[PDB]
Amino acid sequence: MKRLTYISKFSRPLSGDEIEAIGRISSQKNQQANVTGVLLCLDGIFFQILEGEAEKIDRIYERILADERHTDILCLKSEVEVQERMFPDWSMQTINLDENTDFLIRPIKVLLQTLTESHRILEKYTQPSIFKIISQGTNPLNIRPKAVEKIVFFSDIVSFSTFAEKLPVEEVVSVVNSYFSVCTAIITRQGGEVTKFIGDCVMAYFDGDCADQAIQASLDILMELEILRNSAPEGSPLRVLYSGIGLAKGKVIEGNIGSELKRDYTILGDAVNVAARLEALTRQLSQALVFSSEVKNSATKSWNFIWLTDSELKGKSESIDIYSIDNEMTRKSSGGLEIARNIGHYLERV
Amino acid sequence: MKRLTYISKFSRPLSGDEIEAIGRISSQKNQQANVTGVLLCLDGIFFQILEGEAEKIDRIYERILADERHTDILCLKSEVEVQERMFPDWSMQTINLDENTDFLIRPIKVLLQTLTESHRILEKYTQPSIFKIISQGTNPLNIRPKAVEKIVFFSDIVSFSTFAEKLPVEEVVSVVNSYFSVCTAIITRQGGEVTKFIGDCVMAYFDGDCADQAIQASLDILMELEILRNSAPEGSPLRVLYSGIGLAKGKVIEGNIGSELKRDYTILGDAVNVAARLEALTRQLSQALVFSSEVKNSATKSWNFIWLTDSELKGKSESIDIYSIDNEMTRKSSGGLEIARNIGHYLERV
Numbered sequence: 001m002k003r004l005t006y007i008s009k010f011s012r013p014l015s016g017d018e019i020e021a022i023g024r025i026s027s028q029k030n031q032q033a034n035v036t037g038v039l040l041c042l043d044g045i046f047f048q049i050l051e052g053e054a055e056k057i058d059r060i061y062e063r064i065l066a067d068e069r070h071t072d073i074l075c076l077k078s079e080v081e082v083q084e085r086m087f088p089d090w091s092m093q094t095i096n097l098d099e100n101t102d103f104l105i106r107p108i109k110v111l112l113q114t115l116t117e118s119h120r121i122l123e124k125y126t127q128p129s130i131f132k133i134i135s136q137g138t139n140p141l142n143i144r145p146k147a148v149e150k151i152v153f154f155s156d157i158v159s160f161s162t163f164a165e166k167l168p169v170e171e172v173v174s175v176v177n178s179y180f181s182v183c184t185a186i187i188t189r190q191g192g193e194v195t196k197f198i199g200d201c202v203m204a205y206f207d208g209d210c211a212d213q214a215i216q217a218s219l220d221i222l223m224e225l226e227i228l229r230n231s232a233p234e235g236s237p238l239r240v241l242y243s244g245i246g247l248a249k250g251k252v253i254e255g256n257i258g259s260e261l262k263r264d265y266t267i268l269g270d271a272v273n274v275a276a277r278l279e280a281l282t283r284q285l286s287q288a289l290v291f292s293s294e295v296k297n298s299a300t301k302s303w304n305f306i307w308l309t310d311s312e313l314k315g316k317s318e319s320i321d322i323y324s325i326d327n328e329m330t331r332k333s334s335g336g337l338e339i340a341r342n343i344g345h346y347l348e349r350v
Numbered sequence: 351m352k353r354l355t356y357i358s359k360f361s362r363p364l365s366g367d368e369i370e371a372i373g374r375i376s377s378q379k380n381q382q383a384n385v386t387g388v389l390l391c392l393d394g395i396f397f398q399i400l401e402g403e404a405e406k407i408d409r410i411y412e413r414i415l416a417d418e419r420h421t422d423i424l425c426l427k428s429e430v431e432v433q434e435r436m437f438p439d440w441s442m443q444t445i446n447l448d449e450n451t452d453f454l455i456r457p458i459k460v461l462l463q464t465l466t467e468s469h470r471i472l473e474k475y476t477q478p479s480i481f482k483i484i485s486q487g488t489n490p491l492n493i494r495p496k497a498v499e500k501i502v503f504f505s506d507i508v509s510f511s512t513f514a515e516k517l518p519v520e521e522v523v524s525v526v527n528s529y530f531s532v533c534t535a536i537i538t539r540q541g542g543e544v545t546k547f548i549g550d551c552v553m554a555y556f557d558g559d560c561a562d563q564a565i566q567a568s569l570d571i572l573m574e575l576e577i578l579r580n581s582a583p584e585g586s587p588l589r590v591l592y593s594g595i596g597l598a599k600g601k602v603i604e605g606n607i608g609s610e611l612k613r614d615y616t617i618l619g620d621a622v623n624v625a626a627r628l629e630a631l632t633r634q635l636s637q638a639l640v641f642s643s644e645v646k647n648s649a650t651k652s653w654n655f656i657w658l659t660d661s662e663l664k665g666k667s668e669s670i671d672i673y674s675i676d677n678e679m680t681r682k683s684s685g686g687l688e689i690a691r692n693i694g695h696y697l698e699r700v
């Protein structure tokens with residue numbers, strides 16, 4: 001058997017009658033499916049436990065994910081190989097805690113609502129990958145560090161200091177957050193994980209055998225930003241939002257890194273520095289994407305590679321041949337320095 | 351009136367009798383102090399609400415913080431100007447949920463224990479400053495960005511790539527985490543806040559009028575690392591753990607920066623880049639600490655400043671005079687490059 005626990009947020013106000021109606025329909029359907037569980041609500045938050053045969057549970061959950069009456073659905077626990085039902089007598093027992101007045105339940109409700117409102121804020125400051133590990137039954141704090149081969153992605157905004165000096169502070173933050181959103185959506189879609197922001201910089205990583213995905217993510221980010229620039233409103237700072245991207249590949253250490261006050265589950269190692277140093281080279285080139293020969297040679301698709309004969313990097317060991325992709329995008333460009341100059345001219349006059 | 355809500359972890363196993371004994375003593379004392387509230391336990395976690403006159407509540411809480419039977423004490427909510435008591439009839443009502451078998455409380459306990467174990471993990475991946483804001487009644491997600499003058503601190507480990515290549519992965523992570531712990535303890539003690547780790551780098555900040563504290567924190571970190579090196583066990587990698595530190599001062603933007611999957615409450619702006627570029631200069635100098643003339647001139651104490659006549663920075667606007675402190679520490683050094691060479695020689699032979 002399988003058992004799922006999740007929390008969600010009301011998408012709109014729901015009356016007590018509407019909540020009980022959800023419970024009636026849930027009980028009618030779950031009884032036929034040999035599914036049991038409990039559904040609680042407290043001040044605009046749902047909490048549900050569902051248990052039964054795994055195939056059936058998965059299909060019910062996918063239907064629940066399509067219900068427009070809740071949103072921000074977070075799976076807290078996914079238990080497989082469950083032996084005994086927790087709620088064998090309840091096809092779906094509905095407990096509206098807003099309406100409950102029992103004297104012992106009253107303090108429990110206060111603590112549950114305080115902890116829930118804290119948790120739902122902390123979620124936004126937390127990586128989704130952390131929640132996935134917890135839901136699988138593993139405490140991420142006890143994962144031991146390990147050496148692992150990764151593709152490291154590093155990107156930043158071209159001439160970002162100009163934004164910070166020529167725009168209102170609300171608009172500066174809107175631009176950087178738009179950029180971080182674009183990068184995160186595409187990296188995550190390609191199976192990578194964003195691990196760190198610092199200033200206007202993104203650091204992300206992919207599995208070591210996923211160079212094709214790292215390259216595709218990088219090209220798709222550059223195309224998404226081109227579309228965003230061309231379609232932005234008149235006078236919008238997004239019209240001059242440009243990126244550089246560097247990719248490197250190497251053995252890194254993955255694990256919990258930080259202090260007793262705060263840590264992240266992230267990566268350490270030379271490929272992080274190499275990716276950042278390659279990304280900085282894009283400021284002297286017409287190409288917005290550059291990557292090492294190790295990334296190039298690990299790819300399996302027939303990419304339109306171009307060798308950037310020069311390899312004037314610093315801090316490396318045996319230098320490195322550097323490559324890009326030659327497409328209509330990386331080609332139709334007038335190069336950093338010129339772009340930096342235009343960014344200032346444009347932003348001075350918006 | 352004031353009302354405090356907090357959670358804590360049992361420091362050792364406590365029996366049901368010991369829990370009820372805490373509740374008896376709490377009830378006896380709180381009744382005399384006109385304090386009311388509730389104390390819950392669930393699988394090795396305490397939850398407490400206390401309410402009453404503010405002075406009295408603060409003193410009771412300080413006594414509770416000294417009790418050796420719990421640890422990891424986190425204030426979830428501090429309410430001031432409370433008008434009505436939540437638990438007027440309970441000097442301290444003790445509810446041991448492990449022992450409760452009520453049929454409606456049974457699902458509530460399961461959800462409370464799932465949410466609590468998630469929250470206590472998320473705490474370690476979260477900044478303490480976030481929890482402080484939440485406890486004061488503010489949702490940090492809704493704080494608007496603002497321009498603000500800050501001192502920015504940036505530090506990294508000298509020749510860190512050597513550690514990652516010559517030591518077992520568990521030992522590499524132990525070293526970096528020791529370094530991040532040392533920095534965090536001292537920065538926080540001096541009123542600053544650590545905001546970002548990336549690789550082996552620390553980024554922190556202080557209020558704009560706290561240059562003295564940023565300088566003191568920097569000197570105290572360098573002295574703590576000297577003590578750590580000299581007292582490390584035979585053959586320990588901590589014997590060759592060295593730091594560089596750069597400090598800059600400028601207007602930055604403070605606010606929520608990130609994606610829909612993940613954000614931090616942090617800072618953006620040119621002082622971040624300047625501090626990192628000053629810290630990199632320490633690799634060409636005997637001095638481990640360097641800072642801008644703006645930091646120097648904002649200090650109020652009679653520091654033993656030394657002007658590093660050269661100011662060969664890059665990327666700046668009108669360059670910058672660069673300073674350090676000349677003490678027995680920054681003086682008794684043989685300079686980067688030489689230090690980098692020694693780090694490799696030592697770590698190759700441990």
Ligand SMILES: Cc1cc2nc3c(=O)[nH]c(=O)nc-3n(C[C@H](O)[C@H](O)[C@H](O)COP(=O)(O)O)c2cc1C
Nearest residue numbers: 022025026029030046048060063064067069070092
């Ligand atoms: C919080 C919440 C919990 C729900 N739980 C269940 C459930 O346990 N079983 C179920 O079949 N539907 C559940 N639903 C409803 C489904 O989302 C959907 O409305 C229903 O299954 C459609 O059934 P019908 O097509 O017969 O009307 C839930 C909905 C919400 C908002």
Ligand SMILES: Cc1cc2nc3c(=O)[nH]c(=O)nc-3n(C[C@H](O)[C@H](O)[C@H](O)COP(=O)(O)O)c2cc1C
Nearest residue numbers: 372375376379380396398410413414417419420442
């Ligand atoms: C979880 C926990 C909650 C407590 N709550 C109270 C309280 O509400 N009021 C109080 O006076 N002591 C409380 N205490 C106890 C104090 O920490 C301390 O033991 C007690 O006040 C000492 O009183 P005594 O010196 O008369 O023995 C609590 C202890 C623990 C572990």
Ligand SMILES: [Mg+2]
Nearest residue numbers: 156157159160
């Ligand atoms: Mg930039």
Ligand SMILES: [Mg+2]
Nearest residue numbers: 506507509510
């Ligand atoms: Mg370093």
